[PDB]
């Protein structure tokens, strides 16, 4: 199990780790998070007590380095940093554990939630969407815009999701205008899966990463990206059986984990009703449809 | 954005635009079969594509053969319409291509947009106006070329005949809309009005009678009485 120590907690902040969160008061003696499960990506994120605007956080994988948090009072936020001195790090961690000033990643043993939300998410792909190659971890916040949002203004701070557009030459083969627009199987299977993503796992990892950025940071363009990648599958008549089955599991856990009261902004009425009731795959998402109907029957 | 009462004069400026109406593309008669069930028989239709400034009508005849072996014809008709408008634009020299195309039904926006991806600088617009171009098949010559066609065909008509020699496009469009509105509300009356006077003739390549200016004001007046009246007979007022 891995540890992300904090230097200190100078300002009152709500700290999140994956789908857990806890409050830390100004100058409360807090030195980080222990027992973090190896083998998955993680996100540690922040919302200051004084500015509910800007949630922000770091995507990281402990296998790729020793990482810590330190408040920067000039830039006014909690920054992830890498410690290259391996001895200085084990040393810092062991003392803080001994004085028991660390919270424990509170994973229940029955619970596969984080794994099922991050099944296909890799750091290597996260780092291609969030470009900042000098660091092994990736900063996201609420206000970062996507490459496609910047097409319709600082490029170094963009979320480089794969551009999907159903009314584009990429999506529409000359001579198959009606066919390709009403049945996006070409766009899904040939342009995106075979062409851009290479396999369904990379597609699903972007989808899952977009969902989590939407959920944890209220990042609007991530939410747009998640809904588009869902809608492209649901609007394709020809989808590998394995992709559909996994999709149903993927979306089931996303819906299960969404905060009950955030559903009105993160869930697009049109996409979900289309996917679950009108689209080619209206009959292929049994788990997702059952949870949507028993939890958010308003949106339908 | 959308075209409506308020930006109506834009139709008559010098930017080339076309109206597209698809309401007569897919046309059927409904009949009973021997077993007493109901079936449709398609008949020829047409795409109504109109330059409102010049009066140019690029009447594409949709022959019933385009439907053979097709499913979901009402939806196919909208994509077929878009296929043909796109082909028309492509066949046109650059300086003659529209800058805007205004569809009279919102269902045409996505089909036409997709067929015109190759022309990103042509705006595809809807309208809030309830224009009466569906009554184009109540104009005898137009209905006649459509029904007689045995193959796909594009026919040209100036829907304003020679009117622009004497009036502006705004006035010409207003006349046309009033006549079509009349024809749509009561085709029999509308036609009775137009043709009451045997001495007024229709020219070979014209659609409407050769009224003098004074005779147009009477006609226009009588079409207005018609449209008010049929509103009364309909709403009891
Ligand atoms: N309705 C007759 C029109 C003028 C004379 C004969 C052909 C059309 C010409 N239109 C306008 C330019 C593009 C298109 O060819």
UniProtKB/Swiss-Prot annotation, chain A:
PANTHER family, alphabetized: A1 CISTRON SPLICING FACTOR AAR2-RELATED (PTHR12689), PROTEIN AAR2 HOMOLOG (PTHR12689:SF4)
Pfam families: AAR2, AAR2_1st
Gene that encodes the chain: AAR2
Residues bearing PTM Phosphoserine: 236
Any one of the GO BP annotations: spliceosomal snRNP assembly
The keyword Phosphoprotein appears for this protein: yes
Function: Component of the U5 snRNP complex that is required for spliceosome assembly and for pre-mRNA splicing. Involved in splicing pre-mRNA of the A1 cistron and other genes that are important for cell growth.
Record bears the keyword Calcium: no
Subunit structure: Heterodimer. Interacts with PRP8 (via RNase H homology domain and MPN domain), competing with BRR2 for the same binding site. Component of a U5 snRNP complex that contains at least the U5 snRNA, PRP8, SNU114, AAR2, SMB1, SMD1, SMD2, SMD3, SME1, SMX2 and SMX3, but is not a component of the U4/U6-U5 tri-snRNP complex.
InterPro entries: AAR2 (IPR007946), AAR2_C (IPR033648), AAR2_C_sf (IPR038514), Aar2_N (IPR033647), AAR2_N_sf (IPR038516)
Keyword vocabulary terms for this entry: Cytoplasm, mRNA processing, mRNA splicing, Nucleus, Phosphoprotein
Protein name: A1 cistron-splicing factor AAR2
The species this protein was found in: Saccharomyces cerevisiae (strain ATCC 204508 / S288c) (Baker's yeast)
UniProtKB/Swiss-Prot annotation, chain B:
Effect of residue 23 to A: Reduced growth at 30 degrees Celsius. Strongly reduced growth at 16 degrees Celsius
Effect of substituting residue 22 to N: Reduced growth at 30 degrees Celsius. Strongly reduced growth at 16 degrees Celsius
Region described as RNase H homology domain: spans on this chain: 7-237
Documented effect of changing residue 22 to A: Reduced growth at 30 degrees Celsius. Strongly reduced growth at 16 degrees Celsius. Strongly reduced growth at 35 degrees Celsius
Ranges that cross the membrane: none
Domain notes: The MPN (JAB/Mov34) domain has structural similarity with deubiquitinating enzymes, but lacks the residues that would bind the catalytic metal ion. Contains a region with structural similarity to reverse transcriptase, presenting the classical thumb, fingers and palm architecture, but lacks enzyme activity, since the essential metal-binding residues are not conserved.
Further facts: Present with 468 molecules/cell in log phase SD medium.
Protein name (database record): Pre-mRNA-splicing factor 8
Organism: Saccharomyces cerevisiae (strain ATCC 204508 / S288c)
Lineage of the species this protein comes from: Eukaryota, Fungi, Dikarya, Ascomycota, Saccharomycotina
Annotated gene: PRP8
Included stretch of the parent chain: 1836 to 2069 of 2413
């Amino acid at each position: 199990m891995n540890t992300v120590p904090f230097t200190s907690a100078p300002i009152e902040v709500t700290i999140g780790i994956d789908q857990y969160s806890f409050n830390v008061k100004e100058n409360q003696p807090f030195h980080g998070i222990k027992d973090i499960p190896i083998g998955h990506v993680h996100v540690i994120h922040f919302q200051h007590a004084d500015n509910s605007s800007m949630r922000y956080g770091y995507w990281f994988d402990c296998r790729m380095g020793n990482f810590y948090i330190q408040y920067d009072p000039k830039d006014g936020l909690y920054k992830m940093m890498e410690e290259r001195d391996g001895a200085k790090f084990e040393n810092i961690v062991h003392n803080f554990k001994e004085r028991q000033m660390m919270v424990s990643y509170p994973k229940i043993d029955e619970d596969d939630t984080w794994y099922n939300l991050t099944e296909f998410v890799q750091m290597d792909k996260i780092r291609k969407i969030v470009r900042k190659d000098e660091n092994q971890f990736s900063y996201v916040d609420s206000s970062m815009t996507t490459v496609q949002e910047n097409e319709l203004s600082d490029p170094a701070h963009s979320l480089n999701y794969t551009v999907i557009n159903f009314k584009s030459r990429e999506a529409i083969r000359p001579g198959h205008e009606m066919e390709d627009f009403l049945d996006k199987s070409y766009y899904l299977n040939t342009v995106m899966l075979q062409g851009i993503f290479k396999n369904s796992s990379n597609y699903f990892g972007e989808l899952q990463f977009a969902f989590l950025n939407a959920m944890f940071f209220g990042n609007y363009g991530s939410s747009l990206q998640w809904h588009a990648m869902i809608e492209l599958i649901c609007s394709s008549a020809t989808v590998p059986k394995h992709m559909l089955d996994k999709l149903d599991e993927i979306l089931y856990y996303q819906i299960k984990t969404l905060p009950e009261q955030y559903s009105d902004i993160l869930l697009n009425e049109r996409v979900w009703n289309i996917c679950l009731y009108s689209s080619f795959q209206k009959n292929s998402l049994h788990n997702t449809e059952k949870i949507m109907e028993n939890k958010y029957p308003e949106l339908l | 954005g959308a075209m409506n009462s308020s930006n109506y004069a834009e139709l008559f400026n010098n930017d080339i635009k076309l109206f597209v109406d698809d309401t007569n593309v897919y046309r059927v008669t409904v009949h009973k079969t021997f077993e007493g069930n109901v079936a449709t028989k398609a008949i020829n239709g047409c795409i109504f594509t109109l330059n409102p400034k010049t009066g140019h009508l690029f009447l594409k005849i949709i022959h019933t053969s385009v439907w053979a072996g097709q499913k979901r014809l009402s939806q196919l008709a909208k994509w077929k319409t878009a296929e043909e408008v796109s082909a028309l634009v492509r066949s046109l020299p650059k300086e003659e291509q529209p800058k805007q195309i205004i569809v009279t039904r919102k269902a045409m926006l996505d089909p036409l947009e997709v067929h015109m991806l190759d022309f990103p600088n042509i705006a595809i617009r809807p309208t809030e106006l309830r224009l009466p171009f569906s009554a184009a098949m109540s104009i005898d010559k137009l209905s006649d070329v459509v029904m007689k066609a045995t193959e796909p065909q594009m026919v040209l008509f100036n829907i304003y005949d020679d009117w622009l020699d004497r009036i502006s496009s705004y006035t010409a469009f207003s006349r046309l809309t009033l006549l079509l509105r009349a024809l749509k509300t009561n085709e029999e009356s509308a036609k009775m009005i137009l043709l009451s006077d045997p001495t007024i003739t229709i020219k070979s390549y014209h659609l409407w009678p050769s009224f003098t200016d004074e005779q147009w004001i009477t006609i226009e007046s009588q079409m207005r009485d018609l449209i008010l009246t049929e509103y009364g007979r309909k709403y009891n007022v």
